[PDB]
Design a protein around this nucleic acid. Structure first.
Lengths: 96, 202, 147
RNA sequence: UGAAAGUGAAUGCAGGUGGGAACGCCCUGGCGUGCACCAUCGACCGACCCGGAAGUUUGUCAAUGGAAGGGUUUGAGU
RNA sequence: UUGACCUCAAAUCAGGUAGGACUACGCGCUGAACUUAAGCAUAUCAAUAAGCGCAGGAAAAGAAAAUAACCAUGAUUCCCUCAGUAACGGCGAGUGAAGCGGGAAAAGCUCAAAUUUGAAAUCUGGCAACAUUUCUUUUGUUGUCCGAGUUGUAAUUUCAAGAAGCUGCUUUGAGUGUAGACGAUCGGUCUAAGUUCCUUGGAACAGGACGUCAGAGAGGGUGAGAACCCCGUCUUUGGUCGAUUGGAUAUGCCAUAUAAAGCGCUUUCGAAGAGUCGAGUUGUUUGGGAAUGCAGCUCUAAAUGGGUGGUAAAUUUCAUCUAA
């Protein structure tokens, strides 16, 4: 397959290199300062009404309909699940 | 109407096209204008070459990857290997392409040698006449405006000449390998699904 | 030229070659291919069968670049070499066999039409048909697959 | 060539049969030879309908693969 | 009661600026119908004409929230090619791009997010000096007061990185005269040779002799076809004597490099744009097809996150880019 056009690892075999990391690909990494500021803003502002609804539903352990509510609010399951872990982490911290 | 031998007509001429017809009567006039501007630029920027040095890259497709063409500029990694500072390169006329990167030592060595030849054949005038500093020519009397194409062209890889036929080549089935590897790639996903499903069942 | 045209020979004849009964009117049958299922059906179904309807599956964002695979036959393989190479290798037994990279010549597959001389030769190619490679092997040559 | 994945054109002197241009030969015809063309019989390539031999690895029992052979059907083919 | 600050007014307040025209080309908005479909309603005409707003000598676009699936390419624009193609279409009439490839041209960067905190280091305006000029018309520097500014002006950084550190080499003016040379530039100026004879005619610029010039036998004029009568034409991309500019030079002077910067390795940290992305829906658009763009309304994230990989959805990987 290597050096064969067809196959699984198709293509010419060359002396591979280690590409230096791109600074533009570091984006999305949570900084210490960004994490600290967002914690302060969370503690000052609070939660959105739908975030309260999802939190209450998860507390009642109706997770499936909590996920459905989050998806209907945000718009995607990817974002809906991401909010689910965020609010799940919040409630566990509150109970502890 | 349609009653004659030949193709069915397809003339996209139902808009007001006569307003937007484009004629080419200025084709020699445009050609002469480009040359005069080209000659003006060469006289304005002399002695340095009219066209900057470009790297040698490979086009990105199975249809063209066997050819070597000219790129936009030398990558940061290539300049660092050649010993040219990123800031200095743009001053002495070495284009720098931040977007490109060297995935193979073959391409890196190709352009590194390309820069090294350019540096060896380069004459850099001192900023102040009479005091050469680091990279700087002591004698600049013989400077002339030449062409980078004459000094250093983009050369395609030479077609391999005759080589002996080995026994390991003799006992090699080209068509069977092609069909086997195509089927191997085609059912790679199904095999992995079978193996994982069997594993969880076990 | 207009001085060898037919409009120069109809000067004096009233209808100008278009008849007195039917006349030359603007569009007595429609404009273009209009009517190919109603009144041009005789022409369409006799001289252009297959014109109407759908066939096959529909492919989005087709790019011909990853499908590029021009083909060469076996009898054109030796023509792909320079004349000096041909004179050096055809008909003479040498320990080294020539290499014919068909990719450089601009082909993506070696097909099996034709015959080859009795001289071993290395064929470097992306693809090869089944009996094309069989003929090369039986002629003494080998096929080395490139990427 | 197929909608595609894909495969991809020599049993033979690149094939027989009939008519044929031109030439040769023989005593008006006869014999040889047959260009171009059409009638035609077959071979090859692809699609379709069968048929499952190697090989490949991965499930070997299987997975993948698709040679031989069979159609006298199909193509804007050799 | 005085004051401070915020907000909001007034003045023929000090100094400025906007309108209108032109609109071939350029950026938008808005927006048809005739017509084609042999009728016609989707379609087409056409993202056209008309209407409206806003620019420049070009405008726009532009340094990737870009392609691709390669041995990968590398801002934009235009040309050829892809290609009348993929696709879109009462799949009817008809419509219809993009990647690569070849070329013309090429040039890169600037902020917001950082404590200068051992010192708002920044800026407008008044006044007073000096200075400079396409220019007594232009453009500034210095000083000093009022003010703007800490609800943030400078330096520093922009993801291609960078910042903090660490040793160790290399590098440097936003200068101002002078002199001459070398170029460019619009412009005043200079330009070779028959009008010699005969015939015709109102007139010779015609015909016939005899000549001359030619780097000039383009063209015009002059009482008929004039290289030699005249303006010109060639020499000329030049001589000249006056001008304006360009980049070097040859020097003089002011330059406080205590500084500023490139490179080198860091067990390090590394701030990255929100009623925005995205989702649904409704219009409109596209070749974009279980939506290509745009807009309205509803819901509205995130932090290895978020875009895009041209068949909807869920999960998992892989590339790629870094939006508002």
């Amino acid at each position: 397959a290597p050096g064969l056009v067809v196959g699984l690892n198709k293509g010419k075999t060359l002396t591979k290199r280690q590409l230096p990391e791109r600074p533009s690909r570091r984006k999305g990494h949570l900084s210490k300062r960004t994490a600290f500021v967002r914690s302060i803003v969370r503690e000052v502002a609070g939660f959105a009404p739908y975030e309260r609804r999802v939190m209450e539903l998860i507390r009642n352990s109706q997770d499936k309909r909590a996920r459905k509510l989050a998806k209907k609010r945000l718009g995607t399951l990817k974002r809906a699940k991401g909010k689910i872990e965020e609010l799940t982490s919040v409630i566990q911290s509150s109970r502890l | 109407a349609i009653h004659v031998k030949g193709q069915l007509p397809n003339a996209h001429f139902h808009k007001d096209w006569q307003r937007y017809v484009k004629t080419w009567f200025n084709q020699p006039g445009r050609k002469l204008r480009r040359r005069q501007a080209r000659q003006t630029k060469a006289a304005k920027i002399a002695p340095r070459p009219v066209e900057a040095i470009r790297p040698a890259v490979k086009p990105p497709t199975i249809r063209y990857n066997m050819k070597v063409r000219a790129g936009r500029g030398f990558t940061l990694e290539e300049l660092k290997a050649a010993g040219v500072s990123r800031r200095v390169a743009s001053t002495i006329g070495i284009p720098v392409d931040h977007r490109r990167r060297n995935r193979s030592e073959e391409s890196l060595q190709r352009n590194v040698e390309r820069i090294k030849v350019y540096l060896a054949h380069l004459i850099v005038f001192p900023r102040k006449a009479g005091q050469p500093k680091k990279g700087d020519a002591t004698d600049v009397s013989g400077a002339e405006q030449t062409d980078v194409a004459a000094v250093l062209p983009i050369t395609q890889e030479a077609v391999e000449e005759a080589k002996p036929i080995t026994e390991e080549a003799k006992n090699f089935n080209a068509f069977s390998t092609l069909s086997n590897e195509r089927a191997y790639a085609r059912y790679a996903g199904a095999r992995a699904a079978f193996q994982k499903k069997r594993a969880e069942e076990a | 030229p207009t001085h060898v045209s037919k409009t120069r020979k109809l000067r004096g004849h009233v209808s100008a070659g278009h008849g007195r009964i039917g006349k030359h009117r603007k569009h007595p049958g429609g404009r273009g291919k209009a009517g190919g299922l109603q009144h041009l059906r005789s022409h369409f179904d006799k001289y252009h069968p297959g014109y109407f309807g759908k066939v096959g599956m529909r492919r989005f964002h087709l790019m011909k670049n990853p499908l590029w695979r021009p083909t060469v036959n076996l009898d054109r393989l030796w023509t792909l070499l320079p004349n000096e190479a041909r004179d050096k290798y055809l008909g003479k037994n040498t320990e080294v066999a020539p290499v014919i990279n068909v990719l450089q010549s601009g082909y993506g597959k070696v097909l099996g039409k034709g015959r080859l001389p009795e001289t071993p030769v290395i064929v470097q190619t992306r693809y090869v048909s089944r009996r094309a490679e069989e003929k090369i092997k039986q002629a003494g040559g080998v096929v080395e697959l490139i990427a």
